[PDB]
Amino acid sequence: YEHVTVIPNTVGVPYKTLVNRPGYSPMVLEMELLSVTLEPTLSLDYITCEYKTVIPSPYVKCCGTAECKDKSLPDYSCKVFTGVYPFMWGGAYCFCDTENTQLSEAHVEKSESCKTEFASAYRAHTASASAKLRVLYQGNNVTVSAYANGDHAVTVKDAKFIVGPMSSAWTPFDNKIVVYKGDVYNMDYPPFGAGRPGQFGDIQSRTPESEDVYANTQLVLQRPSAGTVHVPYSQAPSGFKYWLKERGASLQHTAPFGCQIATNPVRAMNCAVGNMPISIDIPDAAFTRVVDAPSLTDMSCEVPACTHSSDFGGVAIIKYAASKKGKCAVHSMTNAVTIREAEIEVEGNSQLQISFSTALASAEFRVQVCSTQVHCAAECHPPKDHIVNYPASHTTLGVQDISVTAMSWVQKITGGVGLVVAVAALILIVVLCVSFSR
Amino acid sequence: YEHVTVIPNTVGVPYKTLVNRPGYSPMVLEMELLSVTLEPTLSLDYITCEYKTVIPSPYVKCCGTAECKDKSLPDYSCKVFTGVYPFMWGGAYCFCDTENTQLSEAHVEKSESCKTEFASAYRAHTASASAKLRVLYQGNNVTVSAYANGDHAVTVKDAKFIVGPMSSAWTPFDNKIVVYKGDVYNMDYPPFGAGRPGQFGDIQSRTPESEDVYANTQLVLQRPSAGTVHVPYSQAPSGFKYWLKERGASLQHTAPFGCQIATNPVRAMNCAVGNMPISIDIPDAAFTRVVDAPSLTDMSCEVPACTHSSDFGGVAIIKYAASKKGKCAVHSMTNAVTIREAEIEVEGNSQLQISFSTALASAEFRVQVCSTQVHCAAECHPPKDHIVNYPASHTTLGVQDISVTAMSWVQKITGGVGLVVAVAALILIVVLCVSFSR
Structure with missing residues (x-):
């Protein structure tokens, strides 16, 4: 038997509904979302990671100029210094x-670590909604997993389930994201x-394995100090290492709607x-049968x-007379x-108990038992x-229109001045009528 | 020295621009889009392919009833037939x-073909633009390849080129596509x-190596004929084999804007x-120096x-005097x-000749030679x-007003009609003024 319903997109709250098949006893389903996953489609723009600077042993020309030369490497810089006189330990x-x-001469490269310590810059496109659901009927407590596409029917215990799409098209991921x-x-x-230089993306690669390193570190070589064989230089420190300290809280803490974020x-x-929306065939x-x-x-x-305890703070007794033993919804x-x-x-002539929940300060409602109200x-x-x-554990209040019983003061004072206005108008109509009549 | 320009997005047409650096003799840049590529971002929804049906040897119970045992195979069916009397070759x-x-009993599976003969249903999220370009200055053709993101500067022959962003979103792919x-x-x-049944999608799986076969063939068995041991059945023929016939024309033949499409x-x-948009920093x-x-x-x-031919349909000759031999834009x-x-x-006192293309019926134009017009x-x-x-090889005509010389016929008739109106109005103004003087 085909039945169709809508549940709020709230995880871990049971929503509960009546199957009312013509000619057969009613029964009550309940179900809850155990998990709902949005999952965007990612376009990798580039990988960022810590750079290394490569500085070969400096060549020293005795008694003449070294010629300078060009090389194509990602941030290459080179100089010749003159009037040096380096000492080593022996002379x-x-x-x-x-x-x-x-x-x-020097140039930058990806570090050895960029296999492991790196971050990914992605554009994020729209998302493949997926869901996990628990449902209870006649003591069958059962779980189903599905896409939210409104088709892809899943069968279990010869019941069959279809879910989504949800009414919302919001997602926490913006058009550009970084993941670490x-x-x-x-x-x-x-x-x-x-x-x-010195910011996130001061070095970039199209993929983690590519050799096409973009780098913008503003490396500058400097004059070697007196008597000494070293290679001094100046360079913006890794923009990645700084971002790891500066970054602050990820979407796992900053995001709207109480959502959780994973990678x-x-x-x-x-x-x-x-x-x-969900549809179920049982x-x-x-x-x-309605007579059984x-x-x-x-x-x-x-x-x-x-x-009105946000949970089942109401308790009620129902008196009844039943013709025989039978299970009842x-x-x-x-x-x-x-x-x-x-x-x-x-069974028999007796009474039973139920528990209930409401926002109302005066609870007035009808209970539908088996067929009967x-x-x-x-x-x-x-x-x-x-x-x-x-x-x-319940719907929010109609704050404008579901005020309590014993708000009847509102009717009492509304009639208490409405009849004053009625008499004032009736008086004015009589004196107006005689003034038209003469 | 940095120069910025825009060219129509139209492949294989050269465009011209004038390098302008104040105090230096000008030069002319020619560039040509050799190709431009849009690559959409694909999410695979599913594969489809020809199904196969599997039909095991029929169990025949002599002298009794066989009966179904159910099993959850992708389009399973079972039937039992009565009063059969099968012969084999000896009796x-x-x-x-x-x-x-x-x-x-029978079911359906992906055929063994599905590594070779299959089609792939995709969502197609937004594309990234890649461009291949030729550019010419200092007598040298050079060529550059870039993402058209508007920032990814590429350096070649000691000159720096940057291109994009693409000034329209338009893409020949719809939000969903299939490829074969x-x-x-x-x-x-x-x-x-x-x-x-019987259409594209009558069998599906979420990857070609997956076992998650959805299928909907409407396979139904039939009772066997008299005396015979086979398993007759009815089924909708494999809808992918029909879509290979009924296919229509691929987007390579039908798409707007004369584009080419490939996989x-x-x-x-x-x-x-x-x-x-293009920026080049030569x-x-x-x-x-212009002083040299x-x-x-x-x-x-x-x-x-x-x-006004579509190629270089006109030719001009310029008589000139020049102070020394040299290059001239x-x-x-x-x-x-x-x-x-x-x-x-x-060089010297002489003439030169140059050729041009135009839509003008009566071409008048200014030629900027070296530093002068x-x-x-x-x-x-x-x-x-x-x-x-x-x-x-020329711009589209501004036909809203750009038109012949000997359009002076408009000046003749509009001047004549303007003057008969102006004289009629002056006559009215004079007689109106003396009849106001009364």
């Missing part, structure tokens, strides 16, 4: 006191070949935004206590009153503890 | 004339698990749409013949006239040949 290295020169490990960031990273694959999970053997029911009548309903007709139970056993009404006290660790 | 297979039964080999198609393929990876090429060593250059004087244009100040040449050379004028006779095998 002066040069045969004459002056007219020597030192060539010096578990951390992923919305940031407007510089395009390939656009990155400055490989890049995912956003359990976003509390919008609502989700096998026609799972229904008892317990057949119960002459109900009345009673409320020992009620409290129970459900609440009104969106502002959710119910803990779903099915129960009845009863009205329930009681005053509901406020809860006493302030803050709690779980989301409210 | 009856069953011991007795009736009370026999044949179980028949070289063929790609825009089509609204059915979602995963949504496929109908590995999927690419659109040479879409003649929008325009391409070395300061390419210039020579052979700067022209007494320049006198003449145009022996002209036609030529460029056209009027967008409706394109000069063929670039950086000619000049001359005014040039002609009548154009229309080309004799309808149809040519190449695009126009």
Whole structure:
């Protein structure tokens, strides 16, 4: 039997609904989203990582100039210094006191580490929504996994399930993202070949394995110090190493809608935004005929206590007379009153208990048992503890239009001045009428 | 020295621009898009391919009933038939004339073909633009390849080039596409698990090596014929084998803007749409001081013949005096006239000749030679040949007003009608003024 419904896109809250097949007993489903995953489509622009600077042993020309020369390497720089006279441990290295020169040359490369310590700059396109769901019927507690595409029907225990797409098209990932490990960031990273010295992207590669290193480190060689064979230089420190210190909190902490964020694959999970359609077929053997029911009548309903506790702070007694032993479903007709139970056993002339939850300070609602309906009404006290660790187990209040019973003061004063206006108008009509008549 | 320009995004047409550095003799840059490529970002929804049906030997129970054992295979079916009496080549297979039964069972799988003969259904998220370009200065053709991101500067022959961003989003791929080999198609393929019998998508899997076969063939078994041991059945013929026939024309033959389309990876090429921004920073060593250059004087244009052909249909001769031998730029100040040449050379008192292309019926234009301008004028006779095998070597006409000389017929009739109105209005104003003087 085909049935169709919509549940809010809120993880870990049970939403509960009535299958009402014509000619057969009703039954109550409940289901909850165990997980919802948005998963964007990623375009790699470039990999950023720590650079190394390569500085070969400097060539020193005794008694003449070294010729300078060009080379094509990613940030290559070169100079010839004149009037050097280096000493090594045993003596002066040069045969004459002056007219020597030192060539010096350097270039940047990816570090050996860039296999492991690197970050990825991605553009992120729209997302392959996926979902995981628990459902309960007649004591069959069962789980299903699916895409949210509104097709791809999954069968289990000869039931069949279809889900999505959700009404929301929001995602926390912006058009540009960077990922490092578990951390992923919305940031407007510089395009390939656009990155400055000493900032994220001062060195870039199209892929982690490519040799086409872009680098912009502003390396400058400097005059070697007196008597000494070293190669001094000046250069902006790694823009990556600085970003690792500066970066701040990733989307796992900063993101809207209470969502959780994960990597490989890049995912956003359990976003509390919008609502989700689902359709379910349950096998026609799972229904008892409307005459095979317990057949119960002459109900009345009673409320020992009620409290708007964000969970099942209401408790009620239902009186009944039932023709035989039989399993019975129970459900609440009104969106502002959710119910803990779903099915129960009845026999004979007796009474039964249920628990319920509401925002209402005066709970008025109808309970649909097996085929048959009863009205329930009681005053509901406020809860006493302030803050709690779980989301409210019911719909929000109609704050404009579901004020309490004993708000009848509003009707009492509205008639208390509405009749004053009525008499004022009727008086004015009579005196106006005689003034037209004469 | 840095110069910026924009050229129409139209492959294989050369465009011309004038390098301008104050205090240095000018030079002319010619460039040509050799190709431009859009590569869309693909997410694989599923593979499809020819199915195979598997039909094991039928179990025949002599002298009793066989019965189904169910199993979750991708399009499984089972049936049992009664009163069968199968023969084999030597006689009856069953011991007795009736009370026999044949179980028949079947399912479907991917064929073994699906590594070779398959089609691939993709979503196609936004593309990245790659461009291959030729450019010419200092007598040398040079060629550069870049991403058109607008920032990824490429250096070649000691000059630095940057290109893009692409000034339009337009892409020949729809949001969903399928590919086969070289063929790609825009089509609204059915979602995963949504496929109908006898159409594209009647068997699907999320990768070609996966075992997650969705299938919907409507396979149904039939009762065997008299005396015979086979398994007859009805099934919708493999919908991929029909789509290989019913295929239509791939986007390579049907797409807008005259583009070419190819696979590995999927690419659109040479879409003649929008325009391409370019910046080039040629070395300061390419210039020579204007105080040294052979700067022209007494320049006198003449145009022996002209036609608004789609190639260089007109020719001009310039009488000149020049102080010394040297290089000399030529460029056209009027967008409706394109000069063929670039950086000619000049000496003495003499003449030179140069060729141009134009849509103008009565070409008048200014030619900027080295550091100085001359005014040039002609009548154009229309080309004799309808149809040519190449695009126009000139700008599209500003036909909103850009038109012949001997349009002075407009000045004649608009002047005559203007004067008869002006005289009629003056006569009215005089008589109106003296009849106001009363």
